[PDB]
CSV table of C-alpha atoms (C1' of nucleotides) and ligand atoms in Angstrom, one decimal:
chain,number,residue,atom,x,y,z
A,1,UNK,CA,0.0,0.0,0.0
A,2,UNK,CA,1.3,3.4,-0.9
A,3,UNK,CA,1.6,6.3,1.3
A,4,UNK,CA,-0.4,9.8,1.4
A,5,UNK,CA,3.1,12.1,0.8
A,6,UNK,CA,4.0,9.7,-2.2
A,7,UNK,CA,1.0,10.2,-3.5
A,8,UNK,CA,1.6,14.1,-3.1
A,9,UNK,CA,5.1,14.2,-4.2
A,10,UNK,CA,4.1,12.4,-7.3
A,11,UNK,CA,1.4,14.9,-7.9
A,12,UNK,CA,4.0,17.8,-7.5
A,13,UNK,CA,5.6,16.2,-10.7
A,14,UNK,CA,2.7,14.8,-13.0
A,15,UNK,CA,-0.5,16.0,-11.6
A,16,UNK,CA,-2.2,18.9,-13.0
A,17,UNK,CA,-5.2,21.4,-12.2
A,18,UNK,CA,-7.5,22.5,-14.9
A,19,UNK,CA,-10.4,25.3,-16.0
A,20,UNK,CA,-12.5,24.5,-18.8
A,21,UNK,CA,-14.5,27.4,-20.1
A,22,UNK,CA,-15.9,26.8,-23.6
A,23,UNK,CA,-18.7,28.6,-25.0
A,24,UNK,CA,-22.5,26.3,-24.9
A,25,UNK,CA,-25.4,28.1,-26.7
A,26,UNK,CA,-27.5,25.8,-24.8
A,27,UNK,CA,-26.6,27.7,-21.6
A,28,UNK,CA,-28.4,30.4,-19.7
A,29,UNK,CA,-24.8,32.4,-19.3
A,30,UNK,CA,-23.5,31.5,-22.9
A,31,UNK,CA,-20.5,29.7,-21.5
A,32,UNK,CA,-19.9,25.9,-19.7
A,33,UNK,CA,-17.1,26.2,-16.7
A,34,UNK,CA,-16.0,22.6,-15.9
A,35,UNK,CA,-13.1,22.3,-13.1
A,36,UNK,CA,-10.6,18.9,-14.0
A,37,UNK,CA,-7.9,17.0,-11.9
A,38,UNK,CA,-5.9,14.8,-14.1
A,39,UNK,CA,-2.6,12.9,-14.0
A,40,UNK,CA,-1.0,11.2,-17.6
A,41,UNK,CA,1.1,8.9,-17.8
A,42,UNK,CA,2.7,6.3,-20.1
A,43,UNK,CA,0.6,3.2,-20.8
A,44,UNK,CA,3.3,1.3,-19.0
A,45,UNK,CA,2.8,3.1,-15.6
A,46,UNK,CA,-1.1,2.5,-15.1
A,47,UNK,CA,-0.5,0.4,-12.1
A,48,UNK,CA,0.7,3.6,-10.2
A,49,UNK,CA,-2.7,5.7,-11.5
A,50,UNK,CA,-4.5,2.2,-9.8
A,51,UNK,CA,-2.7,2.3,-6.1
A,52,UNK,CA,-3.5,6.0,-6.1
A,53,UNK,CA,-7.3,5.2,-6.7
A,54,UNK,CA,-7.2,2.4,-4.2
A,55,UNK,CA,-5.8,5.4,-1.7
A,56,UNK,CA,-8.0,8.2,-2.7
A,57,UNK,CA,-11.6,5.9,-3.2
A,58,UNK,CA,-12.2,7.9,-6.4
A,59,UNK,CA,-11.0,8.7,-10.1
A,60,UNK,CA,-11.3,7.2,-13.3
A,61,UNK,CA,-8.5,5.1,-15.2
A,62,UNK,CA,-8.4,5.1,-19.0
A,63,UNK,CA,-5.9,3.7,-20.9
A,64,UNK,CA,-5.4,4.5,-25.2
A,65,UNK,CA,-3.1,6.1,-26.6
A,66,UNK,CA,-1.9,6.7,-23.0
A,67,UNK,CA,-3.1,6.1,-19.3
A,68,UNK,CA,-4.7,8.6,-17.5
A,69,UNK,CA,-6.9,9.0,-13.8
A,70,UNK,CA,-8.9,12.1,-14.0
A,71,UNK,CA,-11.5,13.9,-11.3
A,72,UNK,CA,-14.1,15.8,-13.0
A,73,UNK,CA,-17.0,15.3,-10.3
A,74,UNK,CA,-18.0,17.0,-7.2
A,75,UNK,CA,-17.5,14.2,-5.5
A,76,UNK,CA,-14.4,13.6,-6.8
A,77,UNK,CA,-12.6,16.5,-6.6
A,78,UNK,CA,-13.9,16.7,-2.8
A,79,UNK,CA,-11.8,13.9,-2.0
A,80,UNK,CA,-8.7,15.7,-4.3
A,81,UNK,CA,-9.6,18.6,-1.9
A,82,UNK,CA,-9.5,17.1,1.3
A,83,UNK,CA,-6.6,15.0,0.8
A,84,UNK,CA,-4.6,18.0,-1.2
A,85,UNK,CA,-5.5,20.0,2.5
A,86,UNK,CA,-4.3,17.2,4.8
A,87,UNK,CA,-1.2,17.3,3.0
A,88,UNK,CA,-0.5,20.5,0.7
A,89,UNK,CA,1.9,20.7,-2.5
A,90,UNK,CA,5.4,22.1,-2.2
A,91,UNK,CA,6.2,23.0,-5.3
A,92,UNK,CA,5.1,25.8,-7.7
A,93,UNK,CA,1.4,24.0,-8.5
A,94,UNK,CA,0.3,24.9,-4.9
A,95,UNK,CA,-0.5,27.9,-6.3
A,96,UNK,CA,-2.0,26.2,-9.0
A,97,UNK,CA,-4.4,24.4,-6.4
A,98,UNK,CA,-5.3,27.9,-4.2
A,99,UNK,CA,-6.9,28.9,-7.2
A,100,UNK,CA,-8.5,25.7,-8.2
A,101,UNK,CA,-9.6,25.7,-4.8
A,102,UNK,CA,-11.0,28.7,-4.8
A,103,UNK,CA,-13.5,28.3,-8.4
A,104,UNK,CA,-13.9,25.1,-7.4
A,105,UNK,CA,-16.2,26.1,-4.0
A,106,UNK,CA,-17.7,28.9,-7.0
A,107,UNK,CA,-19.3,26.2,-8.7
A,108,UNK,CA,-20.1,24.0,-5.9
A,109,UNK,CA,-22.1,26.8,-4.7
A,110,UNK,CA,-23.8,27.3,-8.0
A,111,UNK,CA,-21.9,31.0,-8.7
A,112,UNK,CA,-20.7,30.5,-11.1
A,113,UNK,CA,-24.0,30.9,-12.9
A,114,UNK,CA,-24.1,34.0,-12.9
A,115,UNK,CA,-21.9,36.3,-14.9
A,116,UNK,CA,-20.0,38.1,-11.9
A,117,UNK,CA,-19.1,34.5,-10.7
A,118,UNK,CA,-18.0,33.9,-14.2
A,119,UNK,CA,-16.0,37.0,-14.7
A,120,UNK,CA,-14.5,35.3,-11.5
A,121,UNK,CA,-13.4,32.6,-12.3
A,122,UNK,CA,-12.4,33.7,-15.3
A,123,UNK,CA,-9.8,35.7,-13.1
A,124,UNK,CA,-8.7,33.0,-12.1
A,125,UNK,CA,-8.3,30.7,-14.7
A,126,UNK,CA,-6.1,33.7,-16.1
A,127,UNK,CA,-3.1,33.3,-13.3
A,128,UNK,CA,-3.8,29.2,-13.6
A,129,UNK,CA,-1.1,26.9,-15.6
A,130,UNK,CA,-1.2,29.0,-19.2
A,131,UNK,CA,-3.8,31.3,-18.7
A,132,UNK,CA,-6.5,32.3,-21.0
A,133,UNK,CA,-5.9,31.9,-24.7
A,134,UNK,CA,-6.7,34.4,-27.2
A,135,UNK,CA,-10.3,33.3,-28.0
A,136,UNK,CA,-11.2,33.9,-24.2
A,137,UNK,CA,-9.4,37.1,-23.9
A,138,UNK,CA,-11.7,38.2,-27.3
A,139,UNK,CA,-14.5,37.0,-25.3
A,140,UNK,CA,-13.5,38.8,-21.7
A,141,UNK,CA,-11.9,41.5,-22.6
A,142,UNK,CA,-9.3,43.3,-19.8
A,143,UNK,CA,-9.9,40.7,-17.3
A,144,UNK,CA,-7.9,41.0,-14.0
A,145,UNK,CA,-5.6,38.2,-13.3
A,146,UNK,CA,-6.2,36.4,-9.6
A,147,UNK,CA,-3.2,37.4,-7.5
A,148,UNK,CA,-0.7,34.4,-7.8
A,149,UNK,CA,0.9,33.0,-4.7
A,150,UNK,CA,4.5,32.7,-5.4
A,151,UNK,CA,5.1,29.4,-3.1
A,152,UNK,CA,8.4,30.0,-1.0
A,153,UNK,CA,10.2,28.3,2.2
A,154,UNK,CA,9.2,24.9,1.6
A,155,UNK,CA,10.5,22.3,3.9
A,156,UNK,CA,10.0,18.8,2.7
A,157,UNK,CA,7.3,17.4,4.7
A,158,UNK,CA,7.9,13.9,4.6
A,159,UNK,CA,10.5,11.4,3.0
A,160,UNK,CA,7.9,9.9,1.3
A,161,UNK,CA,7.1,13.2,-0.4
A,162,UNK,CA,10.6,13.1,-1.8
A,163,UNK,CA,10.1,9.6,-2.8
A,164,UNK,CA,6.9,10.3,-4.9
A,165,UNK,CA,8.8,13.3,-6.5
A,166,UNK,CA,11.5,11.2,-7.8
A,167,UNK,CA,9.0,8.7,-8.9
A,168,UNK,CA,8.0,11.3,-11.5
A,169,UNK,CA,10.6,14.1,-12.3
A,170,UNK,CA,13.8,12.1,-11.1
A,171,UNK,CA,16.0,9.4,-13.1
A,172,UNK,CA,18.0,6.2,-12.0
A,173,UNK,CA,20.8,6.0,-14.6
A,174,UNK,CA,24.2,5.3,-15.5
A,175,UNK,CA,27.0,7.4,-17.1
A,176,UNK,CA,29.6,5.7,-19.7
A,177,UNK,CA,32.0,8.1,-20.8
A,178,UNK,CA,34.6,7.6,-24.0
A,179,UNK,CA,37.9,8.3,-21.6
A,180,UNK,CA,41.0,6.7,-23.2
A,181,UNK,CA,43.1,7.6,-19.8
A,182,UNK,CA,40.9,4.6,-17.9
A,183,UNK,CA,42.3,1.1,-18.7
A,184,UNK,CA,39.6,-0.7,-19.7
A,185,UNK,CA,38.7,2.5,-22.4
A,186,UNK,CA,35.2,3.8,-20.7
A,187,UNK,CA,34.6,5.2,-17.7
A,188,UNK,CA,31.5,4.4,-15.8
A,189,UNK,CA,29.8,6.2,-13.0
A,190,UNK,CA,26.6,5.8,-11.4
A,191,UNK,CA,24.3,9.2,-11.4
A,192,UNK,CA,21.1,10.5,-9.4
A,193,UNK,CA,19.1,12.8,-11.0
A,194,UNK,CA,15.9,15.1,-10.8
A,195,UNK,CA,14.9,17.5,-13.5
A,196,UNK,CA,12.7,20.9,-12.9
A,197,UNK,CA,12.2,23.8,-14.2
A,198,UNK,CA,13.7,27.0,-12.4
A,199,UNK,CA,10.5,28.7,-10.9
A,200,UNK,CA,11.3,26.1,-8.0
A,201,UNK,CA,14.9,26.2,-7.9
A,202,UNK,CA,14.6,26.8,-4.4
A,203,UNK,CA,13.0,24.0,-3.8
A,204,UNK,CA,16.0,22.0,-5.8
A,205,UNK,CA,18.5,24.0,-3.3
A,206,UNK,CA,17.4,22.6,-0.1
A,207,UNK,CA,16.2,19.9,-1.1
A,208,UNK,CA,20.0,18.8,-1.1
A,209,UNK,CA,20.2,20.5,2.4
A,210,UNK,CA,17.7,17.4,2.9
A,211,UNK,CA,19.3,14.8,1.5
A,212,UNK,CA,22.7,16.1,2.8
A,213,UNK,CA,24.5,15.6,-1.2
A,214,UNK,CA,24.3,17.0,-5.0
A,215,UNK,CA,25.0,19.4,-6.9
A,216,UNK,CA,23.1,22.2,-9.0
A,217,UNK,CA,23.5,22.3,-13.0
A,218,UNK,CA,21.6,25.0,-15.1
A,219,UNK,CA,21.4,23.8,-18.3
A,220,UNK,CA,21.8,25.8,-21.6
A,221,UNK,CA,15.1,27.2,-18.2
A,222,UNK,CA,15.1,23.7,-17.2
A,223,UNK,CA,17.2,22.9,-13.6
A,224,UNK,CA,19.0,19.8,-12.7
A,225,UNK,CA,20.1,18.3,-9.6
A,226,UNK,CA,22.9,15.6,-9.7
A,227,UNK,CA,24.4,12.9,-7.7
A,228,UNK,CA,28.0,11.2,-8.7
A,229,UNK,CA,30.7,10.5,-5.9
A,230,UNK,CA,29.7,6.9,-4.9
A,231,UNK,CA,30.2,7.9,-1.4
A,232,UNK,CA,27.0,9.5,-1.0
A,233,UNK,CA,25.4,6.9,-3.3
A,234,UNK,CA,26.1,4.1,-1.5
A,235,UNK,CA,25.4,5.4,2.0
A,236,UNK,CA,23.1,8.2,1.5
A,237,UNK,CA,20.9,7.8,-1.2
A,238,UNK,CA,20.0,3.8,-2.0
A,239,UNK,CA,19.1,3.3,2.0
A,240,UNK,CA,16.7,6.5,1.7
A,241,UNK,CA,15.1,4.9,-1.3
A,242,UNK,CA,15.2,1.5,0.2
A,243,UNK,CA,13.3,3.2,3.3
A,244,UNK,CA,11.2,5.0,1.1
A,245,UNK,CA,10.0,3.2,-1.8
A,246,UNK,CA,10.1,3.9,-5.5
A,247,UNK,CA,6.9,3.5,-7.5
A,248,UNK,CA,6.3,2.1,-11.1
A,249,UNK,CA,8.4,0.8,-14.0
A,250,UNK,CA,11.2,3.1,-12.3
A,251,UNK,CA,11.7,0.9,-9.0
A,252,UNK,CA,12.7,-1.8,-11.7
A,253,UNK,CA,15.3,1.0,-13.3
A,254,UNK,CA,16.4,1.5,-9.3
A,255,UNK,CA,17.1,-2.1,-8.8
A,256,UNK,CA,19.4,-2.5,-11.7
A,257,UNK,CA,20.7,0.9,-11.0
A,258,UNK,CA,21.5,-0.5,-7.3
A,259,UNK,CA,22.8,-3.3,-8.5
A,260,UNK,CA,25.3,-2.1,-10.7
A,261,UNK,CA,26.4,0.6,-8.1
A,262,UNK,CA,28.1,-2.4,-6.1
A,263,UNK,CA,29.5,-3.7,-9.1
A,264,UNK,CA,31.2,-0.4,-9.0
A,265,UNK,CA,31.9,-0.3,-5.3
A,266,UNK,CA,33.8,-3.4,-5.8
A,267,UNK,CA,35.9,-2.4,-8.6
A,268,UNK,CA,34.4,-4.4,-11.7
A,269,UNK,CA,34.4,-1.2,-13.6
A,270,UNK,CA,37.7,-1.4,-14.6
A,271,UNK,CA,37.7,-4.7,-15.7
A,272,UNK,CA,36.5,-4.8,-19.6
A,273,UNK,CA,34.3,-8.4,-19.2
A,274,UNK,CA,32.6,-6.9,-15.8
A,275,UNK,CA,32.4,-3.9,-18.0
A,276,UNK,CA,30.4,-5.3,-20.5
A,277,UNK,CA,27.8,-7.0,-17.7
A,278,UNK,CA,27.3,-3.3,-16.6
A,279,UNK,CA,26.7,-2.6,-20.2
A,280,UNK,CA,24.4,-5.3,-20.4
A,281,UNK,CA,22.1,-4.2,-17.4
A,282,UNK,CA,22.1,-0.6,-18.8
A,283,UNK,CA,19.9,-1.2,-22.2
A,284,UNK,CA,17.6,-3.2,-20.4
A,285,UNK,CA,17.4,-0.1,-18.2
A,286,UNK,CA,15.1,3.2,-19.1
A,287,UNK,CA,14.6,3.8,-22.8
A,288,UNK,CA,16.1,0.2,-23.2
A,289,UNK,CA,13.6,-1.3,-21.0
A,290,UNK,CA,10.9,-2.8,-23.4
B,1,DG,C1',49.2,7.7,-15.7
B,2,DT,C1',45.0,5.8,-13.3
B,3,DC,C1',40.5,7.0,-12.2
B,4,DT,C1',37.0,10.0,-9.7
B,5,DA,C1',34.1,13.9,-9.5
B,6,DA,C1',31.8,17.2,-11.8
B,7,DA,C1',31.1,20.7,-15.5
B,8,DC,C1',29.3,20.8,-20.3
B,9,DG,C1',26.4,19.2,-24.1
B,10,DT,C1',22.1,17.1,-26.7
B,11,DC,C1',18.0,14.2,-28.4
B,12,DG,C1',13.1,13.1,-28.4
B,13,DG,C1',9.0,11.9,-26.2
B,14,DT,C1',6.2,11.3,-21.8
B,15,DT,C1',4.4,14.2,-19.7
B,16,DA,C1',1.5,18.5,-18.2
B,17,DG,C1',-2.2,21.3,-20.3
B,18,DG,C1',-6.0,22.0,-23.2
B,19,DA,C1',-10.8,22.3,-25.6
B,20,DG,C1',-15.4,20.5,-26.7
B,21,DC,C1',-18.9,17.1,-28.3
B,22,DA,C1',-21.9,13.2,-26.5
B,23,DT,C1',-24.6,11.3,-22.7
B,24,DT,C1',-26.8,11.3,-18.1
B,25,DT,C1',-29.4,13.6,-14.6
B,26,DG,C1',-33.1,16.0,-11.7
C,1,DC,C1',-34.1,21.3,-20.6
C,2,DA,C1',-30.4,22.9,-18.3
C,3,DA,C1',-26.7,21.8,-15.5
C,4,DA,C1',-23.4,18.2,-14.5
C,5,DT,C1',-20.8,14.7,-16.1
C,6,DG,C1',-18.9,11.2,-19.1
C,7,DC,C1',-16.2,10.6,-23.0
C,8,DT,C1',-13.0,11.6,-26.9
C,9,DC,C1',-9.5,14.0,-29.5
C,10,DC,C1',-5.5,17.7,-29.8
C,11,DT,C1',-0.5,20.2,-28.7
C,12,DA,C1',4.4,20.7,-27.5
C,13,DA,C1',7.7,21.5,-23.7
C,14,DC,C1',9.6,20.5,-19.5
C,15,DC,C1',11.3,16.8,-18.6
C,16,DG,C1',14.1,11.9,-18.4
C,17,DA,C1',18.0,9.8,-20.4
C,18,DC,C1',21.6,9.8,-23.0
C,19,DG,C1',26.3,11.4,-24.3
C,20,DT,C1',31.7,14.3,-24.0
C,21,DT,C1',35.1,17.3,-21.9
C,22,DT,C1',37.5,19.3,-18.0
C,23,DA,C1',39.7,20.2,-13.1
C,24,DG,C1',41.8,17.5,-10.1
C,25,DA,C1',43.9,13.5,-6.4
C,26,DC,C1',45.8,9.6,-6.0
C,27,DA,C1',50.5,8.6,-7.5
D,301,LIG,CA1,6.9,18.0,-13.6
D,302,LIG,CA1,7.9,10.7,-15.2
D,303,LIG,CA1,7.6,14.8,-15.5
DNA sequence: GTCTAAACGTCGGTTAGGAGCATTTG
DNA sequence: CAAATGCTCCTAACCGACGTTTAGACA
């Protein structure tokens, strides 16, 4: 059974919050305002949608071109709401859920029917995700944007939060480098990894300070934070992931990833036959894994 | 001269985000 | 019959996952 932060952490990475306002002539206000909760993933993940809808007691899973569990009732995203209280996002989308929070109790209390709680929520579907496209701003012209909480001092608020985090936006993987000063002609080195873009960069910063190792790289918008000295690896990072479990296809790349991290530890890097067995586990690994 | 750690670099698709018709409900 | 909800298609970037070079401690 999964836990209530890895459930949040994940969400932090793949979940989203949504507005729908399309125009319906069959409608007394000219316009259909539909609030959404939806998380995609790869058909190969669907197991991890499943375990969250055995947590939450709500959601529906589809699976086509791609698996998703979305919450478009009142019912549903009641249960999205008091779980998303009990334990509140960290990252930037918090302030994506205030203001889906906030429409969300317009509609439940039949406001938005009328056109000053449509011009509402309007507001704040402009300061939500993208905002409104150029056909709604045609259609509501100067509309004022929500005020936009800009989420700061986040402490982690569970391991398992971090956990579910890395479960979505993070990577298991190894590096295998052309070097011609190593004996055995590659160089190999096991790396940690979790991807996001800047607007929570303070949120990569300490979450280091958490996990007590890392470094910061700022790519060529998009921020990175990396894990390579084997010291912190070995004694830092696999027992916090063994504590705290990895969920999907991924906990099969974190195995393998493990696994060849002792092959390392014991030196069978720089022999070329233990080499190629390190080689061997790494295209059945990630974007090898079939 | 070995090998580690980390800085630097790059592809492509699984994500995040979206809009709207079709069906059910009360 | 109108509001809510179920259901189906559409779009591309912030991701994941892969590479090479450089600044050094061991010697
Ligand atoms: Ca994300
Ligand atoms: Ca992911
Ligand atoms: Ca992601």
């Amino acid at each position: 059974n999964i836990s209530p932060w890895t459930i949040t952490g994940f969400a932090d990475a793949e979940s989203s919050f949504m507005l729908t306002v399309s125009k319906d002539s069959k409608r007394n206000t000219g316009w259909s305002v539909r609030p959404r909760f939806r998380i995609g993933l790869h058909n190969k993940d669907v197991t991890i949608l499943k375990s969250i809808r055995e947590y939450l007691g709500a959601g529906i899973i589809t699976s086509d071109i791609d698996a998703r569990i979305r919450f478009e009732s009142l019912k549903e995203l009641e249960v999205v709401i008091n779980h998303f209280d009990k334990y509140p996002l960290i990252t930037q989308k918090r302030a994506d859920y205030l203001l889906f929070k906030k429409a969300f109790y317009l509609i439940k209390n039949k406001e938005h029917l009328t056109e000053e709680g449509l011009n509402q929520i309007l507001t704040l579907k402009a300061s939500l995700n993208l905002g409104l496209s150029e056909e709604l701003k045609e259609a509501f012209p100067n509309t004022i944007p929500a005020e936009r909480l800009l989420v700061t001092g986040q402490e982690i608020p569970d391991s398992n939060w971090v956990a579910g985090f890395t479960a979505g936006d993070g990577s298991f993987y190894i590096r295998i480098a052309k070097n011609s000063t190593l004996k055995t002609g590659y160089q190999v080195q096991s790396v940690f990894q979790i991807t996001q873009d800047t607007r929570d960069i303070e949120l990569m910063k300490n979450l280091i300070s958490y996990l007590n190792c890392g470094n910061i790289r700022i790519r060529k918008t998009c921020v990175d934070l990396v894990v390579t000295n084997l010291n912190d690896i070995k004694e830092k990072i696999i027992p916090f992931f063994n504590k705290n479990h990895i969920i999907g296809v991924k906990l099969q790349d974190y195995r393998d990833w493990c696994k060849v991290v002792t092959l390392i530890d014991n030196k069978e890097h720089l022999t070329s036959e233990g080499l190629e067995k390190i080689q061997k586990i790494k295209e059945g690994m990630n974007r090898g894994r079939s």
